[PDB]
Design a protein around this nucleic acid. Structure first.
Ligand SMILES: Nc1ccn([C@@H]2O[C@H](COP(=O)(O)OP(=O)(O)OP(=O)(O)O)C[C@H]2O)c(=O)n1
Ligand SMILES: Nc1ccn([C@@H]2O[C@H](COP(=O)(O)OP(=O)(O)OP(=O)(O)O)C[C@H]2O)c(=O)n1
Ligand SMILES: Nc1ccn([C@@H]2O[C@H](COP(=O)(O)OP(=O)(O)OP(=O)(O)O)C[C@H]2O)c(=O)n1
Ligand SMILES: [Mn+2]
Ligand SMILES: [Mn+2]
Length: 1264
RNA sequence: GGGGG
RNA sequence: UAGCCCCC
């Protein structure tokens, strides 16, 4: 460690709280990181005096592996395939030798790539050559699922840990996290690699590059080493930063060693991934003596997902695990995969926890951080053949006799059907009618928003559409000469803009291109990039599904994103007396087929939508005639609406199936079109659709089936007390059945077990295999809960991991920084040990802050000052002679955050600056007599500040665009959007109205007329950048670094005029013995103190924020937050109502709605959060898990502590100031380490009035 | 672009 | 060729 100490000495102390941070040391540390050679990191690793406890037997078979050749074969269709041995799952990358297939690299003679000879033979068509190429390309792919070379993360860890234990400012003692000599993962990493390199001078087992992966030419290297090493590094970092129990961590290493010792690392990982969760989380408290859990009340209406904390629920034996024991299956699993030693140890330790508390949840969390974090990989061919093959077993089909004769592509489900489909059909029919009945549905704007949803910069099987169209002699415009990417639905929209639906209808049946996605702890999933006409025609399906979800059930719309996964719901559901069943449906997409679901859904919508859609087109789709054969004998023609025409065309596609075009670039010669009946993922209907069926069937079970299939009084009573509107929350195929508890305790476990078994049997009737789980735990949207405590899963957030489905190279340098910041933010949300995590993050950041640049022998270097990271959100450890660790990771981002940390030490800074020569006679309002301008330019604080705000990726705008084709394109886009003259007429009105009442007040008027331009830009910025555009990006960053400044942004200079007084610590908002988030306990002072004093966010963040906008949606391309900001700004700038009415007309509203919302906005008392947007202030993401609403309202006093001040008084017409002022106070409170404190407005330099004018100038100048 | 179903 | 839905 002397090697590390010498090279990063001063920097190490700067990030350990011992010495101040300085850009000079930081940049040198950066240069040192870049000058360190890979092999040096290993040499550094050798310098570590590892303890015996950090060692464990390493399997010799991890090095000696068979040839890959017996693991593959050519199938009947000539595709290269993986040959199974351990089951139908054994389709991943096998653990084999690989050096025999490599050619030494010219220069790195010890490293090699796949023999060019072998690929050439493979390309010629040689079976053996193809097999070898496939293996080589997929093994390479497996090794690319990381963000950057492992050595960088390791070096970072060495540098960070060289600082020793950290002194907690709050607890006033050093932490007791074992040093690296006790880190088993690192030891293994060094040994495994050393053993591989053997006598070779090169210590790296492989090199992650841009030109591709290269393997160390050693007979001991295996295709399984990259994944193994990647798991070890994560575990190594986590043991030091999450303060994980070392003994547990070793268990995680053993599993990984076993995975590398097996015949397939990924496969083995997939089969054993439940070990830690099953033997801890799902086995906790078989016995229970005490502890406390939350006591929440679910407010009304439950749909708001709003809860209120009511105290603590004392625990006792009464609440011990009552759910069935998983011991047997868990042990069988361990025995089957050679891990019974691990399962047994976990089972034993889990039993020792008889109290539910911080210690016990941290144990679970720790255990669950040890699961491999690799993104499983297998060839595309394998994913497609495993996911689009299995078909649902409909044990009780809809009788053929129950369908009427056809009505085009659909058949009505006779109302005399005794089938359970009866209910599924009624729900979709009902919702279809109500949806189509809504007036908004027939508003040109609404239909523009819908037509604009799928017009995006992402793909849409562009090539297949062009050819399915060529098949009927219809050639689309090619716009020869435009600098935009052609494979975008945006390009598609422009091509189709001026063609009647009848000419593009065939495209609805065009093939579907391949799209893949790798996941952690899961298998790769195939994706279907539907084309514009396919997405268009899917509208009715999507809208009806949305209507069901908004009006008929209890569901959360989104994908996930911590807190957006409604944390509050899990706390409630998992807290005794309450209990929850974690319902999930396997093979969801493959279970939604025409045989039972789609034929019924298509029918119900087609019919229920009839009367209100009659005699009318929809979203560009015309009405038409179709053959009618409903009645027997009677055969006529039937007029249907455009909406019905859509269902008509969509039904034709759902019936036939999807032609998936598979071009497997990892498997030479594996080109085939696979037909499948599995439901599309890339469809706008997918998510909402599955959510709707989920609740609909659960409703039918609880209302009909269940009751009719049992006479058991308790079960009948239990089911009767459950409602899909009050007790069942779902999204897609995930479900959470919440059984509220009584004073008599919780509902009988045996009665619950009966209900579940019936649900299970119930789904077999229509092809659904319910994955039900009753284990005393709550699991929803990959969020884990036990006894009201959230258990972050560190396993799913691989520090070094990064999904990479395609072969394309990683984005140019700059890009990596956003990823590193994301790694930091995940740690904040996962609750790692704040100091250890912050210090490590500074090391990591420093190690990626420098890049070598080229301009033609013009070898320079791009360096980001430490200050850029602060701007991005990374808190300072110690600066300007301040105490160490005074800054919390809840410090805001950007200007708000800069304001916060600077205000907390304004005086320290001023004093430091003067005592170091930065003095002047001019007395600064913020920094007194400190020559701040000279200081900030020299320290690179201004530089870093501005560099952080520059594009971290090449720009394509400015590419020579031949004006004529450029106008044709944007015209096509315009016609697509402005199809309906009514809409256009609306915007033109807003326009001339704007010139009279709004023009001049603000300069950011959002307008539908901009969309075509924003769409063009999007298609542009989607294309591959050139090396020139790259240089241009660097030059920009480098010019900002050279330039010298005299101030911060106009908004930051304005906030700095405001001063506060931090006062009394707040009282606890929740009980301090209450486990809310594992890892967030008295051992993690700042996070814990913030959680306790500020309080947890007990409402859904989606619901909360939906109340901070006047309009929820708008045409894709415009920014809802932008529209909201313009309206409020106009109001704040004294604009007349007619001006807001004009703004609203320009974004598509009818004059009546426009005038109404405008008049409504004028007289409204706007909330802190919504109002703060007038100046671009947003609630920080890191704050989302806390009760920031309460902080703004009751703990940021705008009235000075000692009464009113002339400067602090808020002018009559400037009440909007209070919202901005609330954010600034909150900033300082949240940025200060420790307990949330009450803060009092102390001063505003030039007074409130002048402050307001200052903000009003910023407002009216945006976009000039 | 980032983090997540 | 590389989809859809969400927090900044
Ligand atoms: N990028 C993504 C990720 C997920 N999904 C959707 O999420 C839904 C279900 O999620 P999973 O549980 O992850 O998919 P399953 O096929 O059901 O996996 P298996 O039963 O193992 O869980 C269906 C799928 O289309 C999606 O459209 N796009
Ligand atoms: N002032 C410097 C010089 C080099 N590098 C880093 O070095 C790496 C590759 O170049 P080297 O071959 O390692 O640089 P050398 O200067 O030739 O090595 P040193 O003096 O020991 O010889 C990439 C580049 O960013 C750097 O960050 N800053
Ligand atoms: N913004 C960037 C990114 C990369 N390059 C050029 O790309 C070439 C090699 O790519 P890298 O592998 O990304 O650069 P290295 O210095 O070899 O190391 P890495 O980015 O970790 O620093 C050399 C470098 O000048 C550049 O000029 N400007
Ligand atoms: Mn599922
Ligand atoms: Mn699921």
């Amino acid at each position: 460690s002397s090697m590390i100490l010498t090279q990063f000495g001063p920097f190490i102390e700067s990030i350990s709280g011992i010495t101040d941070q300085s850009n000079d040391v930081f940049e040198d540390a950066a240069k040192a990181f870049s000058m360190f050679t890979r092999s040096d990191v290993y040499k550094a690793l050798d310098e570590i005096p590892f303890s015996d406890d950090a060692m464990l037997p390493i399997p010799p078979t991890i090095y000696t592996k068979p040839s890959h050749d017996s693991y593959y074969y050519i199938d009947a269709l000539n595709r290269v395939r993986r040959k199974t041995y351990q089951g139908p799952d054994d389709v991943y990358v096998p653990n084999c030798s690989i050096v025999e297939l490599l050619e030494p690299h010219e220069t790195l003679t010890s490293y090699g790539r796949l023999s060019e000879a072998i690929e050439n033979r493979a390309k010629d068509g040689d079976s053996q050559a193809r097999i070898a190429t496939t293996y080589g390309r997929i093994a390479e792919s497996q090794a690319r699922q990381i963000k950057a070379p492992l050595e960088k993360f390791v070096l970072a860890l060495l540098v960070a840990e060289a600082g020793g234990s950290l002194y907690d400012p709050v607890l006033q003692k050093y932490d007791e996290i074992p040093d690296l000599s006790h880190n088993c993962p690192l030891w293994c990493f060094r040994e495994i690699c050393r053993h591989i390199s053997g006598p070779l001078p090169d210590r790296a087992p492989y090199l992650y590059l841009s030109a591709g992966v290269f393997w160390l030419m050693s007979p001991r290297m295996t295709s399984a080493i990259p994944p193994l090493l990647s798991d070890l590094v994560n575990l190594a970092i986590l043991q030091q930063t999450a303060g994980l129990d070392p003994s547990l961590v070793k268990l995680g290493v053993q599993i990984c060693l076993h995975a590398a010792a097996s015949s397939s690392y990924s496969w083995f990982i997939l089969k054993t991934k439940s070990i830690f969760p099953q033997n801890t989380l799902h086995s906790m408290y078989e016995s229970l003596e005490g502890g406390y859990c939350p006591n929440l009340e679910w407010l009304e209406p439950r749909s708001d997902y709003k809860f209120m904390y009511m105290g603590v629920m004392p625990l006792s034996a009464k609440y011990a695990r009552s759910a069935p024991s998983n011991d047997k299956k868990a042990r069988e699993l361990g025995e089957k995969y050679g891990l019974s030693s691990v399962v047994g140890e976990l089972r034993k330790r889990t039993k020792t926890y008889v109290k539910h508390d911080f210690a016990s949840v941290r144990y679970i969390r720790d255990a669950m951080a040890c699961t491999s974090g690799i993104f499983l990989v297998r060839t595309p061919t394998e994913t497609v053949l495993q996911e689009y093959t299995q078909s649902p077993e409909i044990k009780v089909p809809i009788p053929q006799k129950d369908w009427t004769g056809p009505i085009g592509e659909i058949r009505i489900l006779k109302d005399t059907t005794s089938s359970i489909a009866r209910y599924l059909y009624r729900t979709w029919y009902l919702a279809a009618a109500r949806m189509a009945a809504q007036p908004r549905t027939w508003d040109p704007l609404f239909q523009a928003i819908m037509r604009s949803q799928y017009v995006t910069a992402r793909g849409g099987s562009g090539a297949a559409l062009r050819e399915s169209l060529y098949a009927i002699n219809v050639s689309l415009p090619d716009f020869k000469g435009l600098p935009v990417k052609a494979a975008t639905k945006i390009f598609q929209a422009a091509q189709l803009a001026n063609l009647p639906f009848s000419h593009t209808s065939v495209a609805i049946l065009a093939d579907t291109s391949m799209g893949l996605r790798n996941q952690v702890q899961r298998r790769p999933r195939s994706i279907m990039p539907l084309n514009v006409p396919q997405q268009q025609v899917s509208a009715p399906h999507t809208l009806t599904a949305d209507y069901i979800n908004y009006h008929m059930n209890l569901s959360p719309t989104s994908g996930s994103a911590v807190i957006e996964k409604v944390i509050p719901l899990g706390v409630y559901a998992s807290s005794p007396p309450n209990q929850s069943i974690n319902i999930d449906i396997s093979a969801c997409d493959a279970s939604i087929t025409w045989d039972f679901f789609l034929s019924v859904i298509m029918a119900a919508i087609h019919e229920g939508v009839a009367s209100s859609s009659i005699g009318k087109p929809f979203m560009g789709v015309p009405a038409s005639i179709v053959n009618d054969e409903s009645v027997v004998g009677v055969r006529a023609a039937r007029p249907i609406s455009g909406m019905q025409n859509m269902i008509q065309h969509l039904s034709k596609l759902y019936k036939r199936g999807f032609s998936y075009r598979v071009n497997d670039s990892f498997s030479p010669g594996n080109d085939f079109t696979h037909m499948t009946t599995t439901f599309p993922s890339g469809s706008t209907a997918t998510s909402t659709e599955h959510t709707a069926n989920n609740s609909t069937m659960m409703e039918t079970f609880l209302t009909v089936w269940g009751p009719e299939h049992t006479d058991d009084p308790d079960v009948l009573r239990l089911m009767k007390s459950l409602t899909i509107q009050r007790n069942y929350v779902c999204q897609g195929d995930d479900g959470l059945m919440i059984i509220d508890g009584t004073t008599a305790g919780k509902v009988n476990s045996e009665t619950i077990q009966n209900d579940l078994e019936l649900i299970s049997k119930y789904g077999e009737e229509f092809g659904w295999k319910y994955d039900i789980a009753y284990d005393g735990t709550a699991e929803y949207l990959k969020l884990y809960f036990i006894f009201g405590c959230r258990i972050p899963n560190l396993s799913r957030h691989p520090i070094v991991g990064k999904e990479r489905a395609n072969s394309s190279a990683e984005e140019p340098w700059p890009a990596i920084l956003d990823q590193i910041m994301g790694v930091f933010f995940n740690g904040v949300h996962d609750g790692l040990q704040w100091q250890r995590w912050i210090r490590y993050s500074w090391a990591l950041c420093c190690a990626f802050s420098r890049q070598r640049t080229m301009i033609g022998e013009s070898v320079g270097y791009l360096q980001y000052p430490m200050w850029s990271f602060v701007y991005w959100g990374l808190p300072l450890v110690k600066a300007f002679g301040s105490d160490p660790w005074i800054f919390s990771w809840y410090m805001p981002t950007g200007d708000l955050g800069m304001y916060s940390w600077i205000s907390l030490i304004r005086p320290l800074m001023t004093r430091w600056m003067v005592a170091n020569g930065y003095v002047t006679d001019r007395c600064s309002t913020v920094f007194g007599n400190a020559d701040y301008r000279r200081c900030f330019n020299e320290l690179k604080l201004y530089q870093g500040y501005y560099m952080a705000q520059l594009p971290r990726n090449p720009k394509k705008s400015g590419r020579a665009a031949s004006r004529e084709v450029r106008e044709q394109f944007t015209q096509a886009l315009s016609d697509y959007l402005m199809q309906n003259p009514e809409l256009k007429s609306r915007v033109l009105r807003g326009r001339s109205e704007w010139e009279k009442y709004g023009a001049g007040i603000i300069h950011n008027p959002p307008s539908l007329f901009d969309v075509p331009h924003k769409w063009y830009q999007g298609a542009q910025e989607a294309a591959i950048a050139t090396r020139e555009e790259l240089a241009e990006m660097d030059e920009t960053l480098m010019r900002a670094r050279r330039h010298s400044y005299s101030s911060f942004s106009k908004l930051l200079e304005a906030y700095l005029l405001v001063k506060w007084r931090m006062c009394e610590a707040r009282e606890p908002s929740v009980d301090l013995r209450l486990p809310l988030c594992a890892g967030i306990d008295p051992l993690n002072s700042d996070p814990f103190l913030k959680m306790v004093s500020v309080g947890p966010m007990l409402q859904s963040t989606r619901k909360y924020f939906a109340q901070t906008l006047f309009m929820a949606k708008t045409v894709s391309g415009l920014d809802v937050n932008a529209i909201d900001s313009a309206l409020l700004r106009l109001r704040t700038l004294g604009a007349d109502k007619k001006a807001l009415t004009a703004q609203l007309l320009m974004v598509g509203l009818q004059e009546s709605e426009a005038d109404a919302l405008a008049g409504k906005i004028m007289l409204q008392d706007v909330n802190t959060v919504q109002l703060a947007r007038v100046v671009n202030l947003a609630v920080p993401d890191t704050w989302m898990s806390l009760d920031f609403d309460s902080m703004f309202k009751h703990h940021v006093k705008l009235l000075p502590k000692d009464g009113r001040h002339l400067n602090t008084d808020i002018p009559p017409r400037m009440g909007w100031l209070r919202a901005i002022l609330r954010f600034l106070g909150a900033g300082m409170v949240m940025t200060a380490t420790g307990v949330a404190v009450d803060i009092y407005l102390e001063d505003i330099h030039g007074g409130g009035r002048s402050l307001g004018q200052r903000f009003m100038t910023w407002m009216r100048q945006e976009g000039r």
